[PDB]
Design a protein around this ligand. Structure first.
Ligand SMILES: *[C@H]1O[C@H](CO)[C@@H](O[C@H]2O[C@H](CO)[C@@H](O)[C@H](O)[C@H]2NC(C)=O)[C@H](O)[C@H]1NC(C)=O
Ligand SMILES: *[C@H]1O[C@H](CO)[C@@H](O[C@H]2O[C@H](CO)[C@@H](O)[C@H](O)[C@H]2NC(C)=O)[C@H](O)[C@H]1NC(C)=O
Ligand SMILES: O=[N+]([O-])c1ccc(O)c(OS(=O)(=O)O)c1
Ligand SMILES: O=[N+]([O-])c1ccc(O)c(OS(=O)(=O)O)c1
Ligand SMILES: [Mg+2]
Ligand SMILES: [Mg+2]
Lengths: 481, 481
């Protein structure tokens, strides 16, 4: 009975990048087709605009400060990881009998002997890279075949990026023009195996598109008419078209819920090789709408009727909604999301009225940076980020430093989604929205205690995955293409 | 045989305002439905981002400097107007037997005894206001029923806005909450009368939405969830839904070509009561993409198949395309547009490769400000405008004065439609695009001679339309509600 679930999570992709979200040149026909027969959200959100914290929140339904996933993101030498006691969505569904799989980016920790890798967090199967694909040297990697090298080099002084099958290194580094196809093959097998055993499957496809450095297989190199960023988005979109074909071919259309979102807004510091937040302001690394408001699509023919909703939804609501849909029980922990099955099924409204946004570097003295309630969003603190530099808006740059606002900056996102016109720069609707927003911020700051930072437990170069264990010299001996 | 034609032209509406162009809160379901069964253009343009010059170019297929429609816009006391010797599209179709009508904004001149009004330029029927609805006092007008007054007062010291039936004043001023409906009634009658006489009709519906001051009838007041700007856009959209119903009811679906565009980009100086250029830069009054790149839809079931094109098209191409479609002959004048029927019918590509943009205040020493060819756009001069003030981009403000660029600022609009990354800030594709762009600018500047300015022929307060001719005191005695 429980539907099969496929969760596609893109990387560094903005609200204005899909064709269906208005981009003038992107090529995304499969995603456009899913929107046209599915529910397109205009107001869906992640609570923190960086990969690690966002990935933690999506898999646990909890604000990332609760389990220490701050500040910044994890790196290959990190000792820390998402604690093994947090219950992931994967555990929740596995315990109700789903065959569960993950392909692609994890970024939730590696640890001493791979203790934090996915196999330990509820996934039966895993094929991917344990952190972003740019966290290792890439000046010699090919990003576009036959031999266009990746641009800029990526991180130096580290082992090459490992492609892992469960806990074993399959390739180091992998060939980027074919990674995707490896991931579609793995998915195809997970589906079939599950059909075979009469069991519901759960696929978590964390794609590398459209994170720097851009890359694609040869059918897309130079065919999107938006350069490398388009080519990489176009391959992502073709991958979605492949999952939907596989779902067709096994007669699983009406029994599969397919969700598409992305972890955080665009990295505009990659300029024309990064994504686009459309009308929204700034991008990745900030708490402006461009960093935390993502594209989101839900498709389940015969269950979700085609349309557009404006209701509030978050990545935080994913665990509890999917649990409900699977008749799986909720962990016995404080959860920060809700079940949105009534909104999906068209029988109710979203129960979500408020959203809370933390910065990349949060702290317990300042607490939440911004809050949305209804149509009103207040910013109590503002800051730009080097991930959102290079555009003409000075508030997005790294040089717009941390600034306190009291009274907060207050926007009406139904008329001013661009966040340009501070409404306190008076009215009774406004004044009542102000008092609610301040009381929600002070209630959340007083009730959440920050879990001890995983990121500050430090780095140890010995934790890098090495294809040729014990080899020498480290790290360049670690490699098995 | 010739199809019936309905040209809907909106006012001050941006590229990111329709739901189908990505806006998160606008409500435009009829327009979204026309896009879903029609051709949606991602790269359609007007050559000048102000009402008068844009309206002239659309009706004549000629760059507005050729017939003197600069600088700025005409005002109620203007002696000048679009010369009576220019051939409009309306003349062209009337001569092939179309019954032709216009409802709404004209802004192409009034003149001594209404010499420039529409009845003299090929329209058989006319119901509307001869210039924008804000060109007269509005501190006492109702914008939203039952008694919400228009905001800010509009222009002072002038006669109230006249609603005209051909050359006679029907109301002065008209009641804004019902103007629209008057215009749908007139349209409905034009259609029916033409069906009756077995003749093809041509309707030019120049709506007042979404120009300041915003207004709507009671079914839309406060129902769009985007405030007054949404309410006004929502009424516009409901009007489109009414024309399409009338077309249904007379069995004229497959025989009517329906086109939707807008004259110029958004007036962001009205802030949350003005429109949104989406990812594009700046708006009304500039030569950035946000001022000149508009939404555009073409719908003709059984002739135009549903889709999205990225080909180049301009408002300038409208006369010659519609002539071709009607088997009407072209005037014997130099035209600056082309026939895009092959692109509409799906048998050819657009023949347009280049676009030329003039500023609101052009001059023969500086010539064209920007040129697009292929995917490359060069700006030879840049300037902000008080119509595009109040956003965070400093290049859009009135204080960014006229600046020459040599080498020009050069953008790749397929990867950088936001116009952020100057490519000369080297490569052979770039260098060849540069040499083409400079040669196109110098060829057009050398070949176009500016027609003598109509706007500088001056003003005469005696040219104001007065409901009670000879009354006194002028202008406040002029009024007949
Ligand atoms: C590593 O781990 C999983 C689980 O052990 C491997 O398991 C699957 O492999 C085969 C099917 O592909 C079968 O031998 C097993 O039944 C199957 N196990 C389960 C629980 O499904 C898997 O191949 C490896 N991970 C992947 C796909 O890389
Ligand atoms: C004013 O001018 C036109 C043309 O004279 C008027 O003409 C139309 O009015 C009636 C139908 O609505 C008929 O009496 C005429 O046949 C018809 N003329 C043509 C050529 O169609 C019209 O009513 C006035 N304009 C409008 C609609 O306001
Ligand atoms: O924030 N960072 O320091 C950072 C570093 C490397 C990434 O590759 C990255 O992108 S992220 O992993 O998607 O957040 C972010
Ligand atoms: O540019 N102007 O000076 C101007 C004046 C009044 C308008 O109402 C206006 O808007 S316009 O008529 O759409 O261009 C523009
Ligand atoms: Mg990311
Ligand atoms: Mg206008």
């Amino acid at each position: 009975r429980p539907p099969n679930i496929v969760l596609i999570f893109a990387d560094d992709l903005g609200y204005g990048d899909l064709g269906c979200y208005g981009h003038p040149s992107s090529t995304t026909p499969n995603l456009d087709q899913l929107a046209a027969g599915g529910l397109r959200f205009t107001d869906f959100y992640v609570p923190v605009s960086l990969a690690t914290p966002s990935r933690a929140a999506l898999l646990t339904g909890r604000l990332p400060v609760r389990m220490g996933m701050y500040p910044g993101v994890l790196v290959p030498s990190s000792r820390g990881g998402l604690p093994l006691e947090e219950v992931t969505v994967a555990e929740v569904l596995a315990a109700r009998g789903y065959l569960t799989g993950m392909a692609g980016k994890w970024h939730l920790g590696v640890g001493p002997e791979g203790a934090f890798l996915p196999p330990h967090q509820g996934f039966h199967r895993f094929l991917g890279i344990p952190y972003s694909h740019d966290q290792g040297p890439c000046q010699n990697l090919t990003c576009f075949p036959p031999a266009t090298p990746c641009d800029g080099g990526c991180d130096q002084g580290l082992v090459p990026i490992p492609l892992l099958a469960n806990l074993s290194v399959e390739a180091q580094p992998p060939w980027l023009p074919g990674l995707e196809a490896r991931y579609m093959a793995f998915a195809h097998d997970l589906m079939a195996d599950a059909q075979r055993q009469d069991r519901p499957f759960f696929l978590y496809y964390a794609s590398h598109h459209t994170h720097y450095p851009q890359f694609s297989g040869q059918s897309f190199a130079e065919r999107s008419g938006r350069g490398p960023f388009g080519d990489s988005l176009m391959e992502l979109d073709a991958a979605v078209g492949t999952l939907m074909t596989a779902i067709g071919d096994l007669g699983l259309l009406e029994e599969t819920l397919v969700i598409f979102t992305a972890d955080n807004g665009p990295e505009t510091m990659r300029m024309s090789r990064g994504g686009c937040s459309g009308l929204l302001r700034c991008g990745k690394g900030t708490t402006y709408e461009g960093g935390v408001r993502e594209p989101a699509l839900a498709f389940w023919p015969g269950h979700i009727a085609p349309g557009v909703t404006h209701e509030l939804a978050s990545s935080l609501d994913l665990l509890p909604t999917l649990a409900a849909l699977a008749g799986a029980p909720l962990p016995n922990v404080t959860l920060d999301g809700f079940d949105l099955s009534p909104l999906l099924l068209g029988t109710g409204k979203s129960p979500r009225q408020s959203l809370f946004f933390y910065p990349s570097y949060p702290d317990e003295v300042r607490g939440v940076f911004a809050v949305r309630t209804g149509k009103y969003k207040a910013h109590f603190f503002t800051q730009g980020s080097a991930h959102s530099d290079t555009t003409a808006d000075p508030a997005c740059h790294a040089s717009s430093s941390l600034t306190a606002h009291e009274p907060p900056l207050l926007y009406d996102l139904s008329k001013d989604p661009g966040e340009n016109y501070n409404l306190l720069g008076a009215t009774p609707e406004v004044l009542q929205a102000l008092k609610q927003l301040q009381l929600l911020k002070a209630q959340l700051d007083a009730a959440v205690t920050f879990g001890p930072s995983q990121v500050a437990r430090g780095e140890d170069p010995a934790l890098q995955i090495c294809c040729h264990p014990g080899c020498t010299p480290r790290p360049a001996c670690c490699h098995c293409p």
